[PDB]
Design a protein around this nucleic acid. Structure first.
Ligand SMILES: [Zn+2]
Lengths: 70, 58
RNA sequence: CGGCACCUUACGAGAAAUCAAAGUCUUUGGGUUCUGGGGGGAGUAUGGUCGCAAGGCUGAAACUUAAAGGAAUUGACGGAAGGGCACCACCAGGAGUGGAGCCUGCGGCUUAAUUUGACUCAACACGGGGAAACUCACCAGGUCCAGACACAAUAAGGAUUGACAGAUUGAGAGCUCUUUCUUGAUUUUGUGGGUGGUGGUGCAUGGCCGUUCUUAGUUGGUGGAGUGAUUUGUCUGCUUAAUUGCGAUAACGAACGAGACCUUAACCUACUAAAUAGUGCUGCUAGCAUUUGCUGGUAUAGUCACUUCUUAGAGGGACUAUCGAUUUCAAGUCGAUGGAAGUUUGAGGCAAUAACAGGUCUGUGAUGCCCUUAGACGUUCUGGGCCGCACGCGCGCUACACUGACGGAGCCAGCGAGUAUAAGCCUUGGCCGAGAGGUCUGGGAAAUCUUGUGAAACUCCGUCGUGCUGGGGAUAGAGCAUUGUAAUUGUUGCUCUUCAACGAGGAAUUCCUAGUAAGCGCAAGUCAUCAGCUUGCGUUGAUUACGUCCCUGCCCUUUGUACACACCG
């Protein structure tokens, strides 16, 4: 019974930020060597080896179990 | 009296129906077998012959 | 004989109304004059003729139209008549309302929204609509897809979802923005397809409800009338609550509705039983007089009896019964007698033929169509609203004092409701609190306990003493609790204080005939809290009629109609 008129601008939903081969960054391969594991995979009892923290500013986080260090 | 109302789906709208059906009172086996005002008179047993004064000993 | 006519019947005529002529007319012919060929245009134009004129007489066509019209029938309507019924009419009364404040609703006004439906009865304490949140449909803000399914796009070198720190936001919404983490083919884009709406359309509908009208009305079978649609039955009179009966009768006998029927109230010492009801005895016990008497408690073993009262199941009981009258002596009615009941025994439930532009898409996963459908009119959550106030109106409650206020003392009803791992019911009994309220136990899933819901009017005893008084509790402040996340626009209560109009209500108008009206309280509902409201129940309990058509309304008949979409024609 009233034509809904807006004032605030349209808000746009977040799009998951895409990267090319994010798997590459977590490791360094050494000739005649083995895995590096440079991103400090989570040692919590919930998630085991192979999936890593997030080297943010002053914190390191993994989305699967919510915690940050330092 | 038992009734059943249904709305049969038409493309143009709703068509409601009612069906009212009576079992015959003589066909009832559970409640009353007739109407409240149904008065059924039995027929006369008269028109017999009476003789003056005998005695019947069996 | 002539006339003006009238009454009955219809051999006969007619479409019928009707007609002794409108008969002797498809069985068509006594003589003769005049006029008409669907409705309009139009008795108009023009010409002619008569007239002082007004006009008279004669008198078209173009064009336009599918009808106009006659008689009768059913209905509808009538500012027509005649009857009937009715406390949604009156008589005689009672109680009021309408005058003050206040709760609530309507319109109006304001508003950010003050959502809206409804306006004579049949709108306005109605939507069970007593709205903090939710309801909510509104307003200012913010999320979610909870967009199924077939495709085209993208996608493993990842289609994309969840997200720690900060920023922002009302928000500790990863809603978003910097942050680069994290799961992995569920899934991201466009279309088709949808899905959902307290969105519009109740004047597109269903269903339900209200109204006609709970009035008493409605219909066919055979027969009679009429060419027929239809009519009679289905009606002058009396009677009844009543189309219900008597009675009269071209009708006879039936069906629906009414009445019958069902639920509830009254009777049952007559049956059937009841420790979840009571009583009397008997024990065990307590008080007072001592008469052996009178009042309690206890007895789920006193291993008592009984159903009078309490409960319900099988029944009986009333059918105007008997008698006087009145009347058609009929249907009935009025006075007495008995009876539990003699008003339809009381009160309700159900309730006909078709119908209404009565109300509701704001109850439904009930729907057709229009709109939207991802920045959603879906949804969710935040803050506000329905309450908002110069105003008119309605349903009501307090009251206007003394048949009364309080303060003591007496102390009697009935309908009902109730929980377990909940998310909290009724809540006793005890213990605190002036109160409201607080604490600890128990019982009851239920004639057990809440609860004898020990209610108020009322009864008795004193204070007040006609004063706006101590009748009334509006306006307003402070403090104390409960309810709920959240009480501010005071939820609600309590304590103190504040001491408003109101001194009986103009014009109008409402309800009502016996446990009725009027007072007086209690329960269930909407409920986390809130009842001045309804729905029920019970206490006390009347005045006057038991008649009428004067007002009103409706029904029926007669009547009128150019209406039938039916006078809102
Ligand atoms: Zn981890």
């Amino acid at each position: 019974r009233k034509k809904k008129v807006y004032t605030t601008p349209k808000k746009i939903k977040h799009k998951h930020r895409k990267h090319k081969l994010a798997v590459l960054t977590y490791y360094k391969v050494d000739n005649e060597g083995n895995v590096e594991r440079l991103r400090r995979e989570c040692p919590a009892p919930t998630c085991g080896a192979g999936i890593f923290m997030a080297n943010m500013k002053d914190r390191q986080y993994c989305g699967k179990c919510h915690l940050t260090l330092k | 009296i038992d009734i059943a109302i249904r709305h049969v789906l038409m493309r143009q709208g709703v068509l409601g129906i009612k069906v009212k059906i009576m079992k015959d009172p003589a066909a009832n086996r559970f409640g009353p077998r007739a109407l409240p005002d149904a008065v059924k008179i039995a027929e006369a047993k008269d028109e017999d012959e009476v003789i003056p004064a005998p005695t019947v000993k069996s």
